[model samples]
Target: HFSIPETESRAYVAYNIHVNGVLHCRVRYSQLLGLHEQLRKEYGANVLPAFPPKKLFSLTPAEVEQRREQLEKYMQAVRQDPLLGSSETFNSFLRRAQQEAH
Candidate 1:
């Protein structure tokens, strides 16, 4: 999430997402976006939850925190995905799969 110039700010949420004992990865919200984009490509547009509104500048620190919470909430929902959560592309995105997806 980001807020404009006067009080310009940007913050990312790092999620230590784990899938059983099968996998765990260090991922920030931007990485989540990349995976979400790929999932939409492979699955469907409605595959996940609502993303927060587009970035803006000059938001109150409170607003930035709000976006962070919202973004985090969205990712938590993905973590619960019944099918997409266990798919090849999604796992690859969380793997040593940075360059291509990001």
Candidate 2:
């Protein structure tokens, strides 16, 4: 006989600290156990949990411009000498970073 593992319910809360030392809190809860399973499928089971997840915030117009400037500098450096294996990763990171700039 075989038995399937049971799914557990979990809650997650996030906090952001601005440069001015203000803390913003957001709480979210989900009963969906498939999140972990989906992550394991996309990334190998051995993948470290330290890998950062994507943020769910939007950036202000000013923040967007600032991030774009920083990304431009990074892109230029990558173009001058390809040290990091893939510009694709950097591009993706910058995109997410820009989104969270606000």
Candidate 3:
């Protein structure tokens, strides 16, 4: 139900994620990390998929692709979870992205 088609590089890297075959939003890795941080704060630590490392520098294209895959998995896991997917936090996060996208 989710896919990351590519990455954008402006001042920083942003992943172009699509939902239901349409562009939903372009999210930075830091933003994803913050989302996870909030989810963990509300739910707990052991609830989501593994996250990409935040400390890495000098990212090769391959590593970025790997990060994309990992992030995709994380998103899918959250989406599949009944509680997490329906939360105000997650929905508001998406709505915020949708607003920024337009």
Candidate 4:
């Protein structure tokens, strides 16, 4: 249901957060990190998969691919949870992201 089909790095890097084969949003690592922190507080620690850590230096193509996979898994796991999937926190973030997509 969720996937990061490709990554586009223009002025800065943004991961394509796609939903059901459509582009949902282009989110930066910081934005997703915010969501992750909120989710952990709401659902408790270790409930979700570990978030991909930021690279201190420039990222190689292989590293980017690894991050894409990690982000995909995070989104998939979050959406699969019945409670978290339906939570206001999650949906609000999605709606906001969708707005940003326009």
Candidate 5:
């Protein structure tokens, strides 16, 4: 039997997404709260995409990276959902993002 150090820690995706007929098998937290706060005052109601609640704990670089990716996963779902996708904020971003993406 061996003991693994507490510092020796690591972390661990599955989802289906389709963008413009393209299959992208791809895809978190204070960033979520700060975002929500900004959206709430502006939009009223939870019409904005759900930003995740940030974490308050000891974490590793890899662990945080894991969560950052998870945030992407979360947003990917939002991108597919009409609840927020149809929202004005989203539409506005979608409009402006096009220019940037190109």
Candidate 6:
């Protein structure tokens, strides 16, 4: 069920591994090359390529410290909120988040 296309024309080759309707993996460099050539023909060159590094910036030291304190305060406020105690789903989610954090 495979064919190969050379620079001038397409060439097809077939082989039966069995007669009992069983399937097995075939070992052939030409089959691999056929797949590679087919992909190159369909998608051109550079079908799969790596990307360049992204430019990233970090927060300042003071901003990083402020974020930590803000997050702690927000967490405390949410824990003490009476409305949060009534939601079983929210409590279960928070329990799972706490377990994953550890």
CA lDDT, every prediction? 0.58, 0.34, 0.86, 0.87, 0.47, 0.35
- Winning candidate number (lDDT): 4
Task: Let me know the TM-score candidate 4 reaches against the reference structure.
Answer: 0.91
lDDT of 5 by residue, 21-102 (tens): 4443222134344444655776674555555555567666776556555556655655666665566765564455344433
Question: Per-residue lDDT of 32-97 in model 1, one digit per residue for the tens?
Answer: 677678888877887667776765565566876676667656756665688766778766665664
**Clash count, one per candidate:** 4, 0, 0, 0, 2, 0
Rank the candidate models, highest TM-score first: 3, 4, 1, 5, 6, 2
**Model 3 clashing residue pairs (backbone):** none
The number of the candidate with the highest TM-score is 3
TM-score for every candidate vs. truth?
Answer: 0.57, 0.28, 0.93, 0.91, 0.42, 0.37
The 10-residue segment with the lowest total lDDT in model 5: 1-10
lDDT of 4 by residue, 1-102 (tens): 898998898766889988889888989888999998898897888667778897888778998889889989988888888878888888999999999887
List clashing residue pairs in candidate 6: none
Give the winner by TM-score: 1 or 5.
1
Ranking by lDDT: 4, 3, 1, 5, 6, 2
Error of 4 at 3 (Å): 1.2
Q: How many backbone clashes does candidate 6 have?
A: 0
Q: Distance (Å) between predicted and true CA of 87, model 3? A: 1.1
Residue-level lDDT for 6 in candidate 4: 88
Provide the lDDT at 75 for model 4. Answer: 85
Candidate 3: where is the Cα deviation over 4 Å? none
Candidate 5 overall Cα lDDT vs. reference? 0.47
**Local error of candidate 6 at residue 66 (angstroms):** 0.1
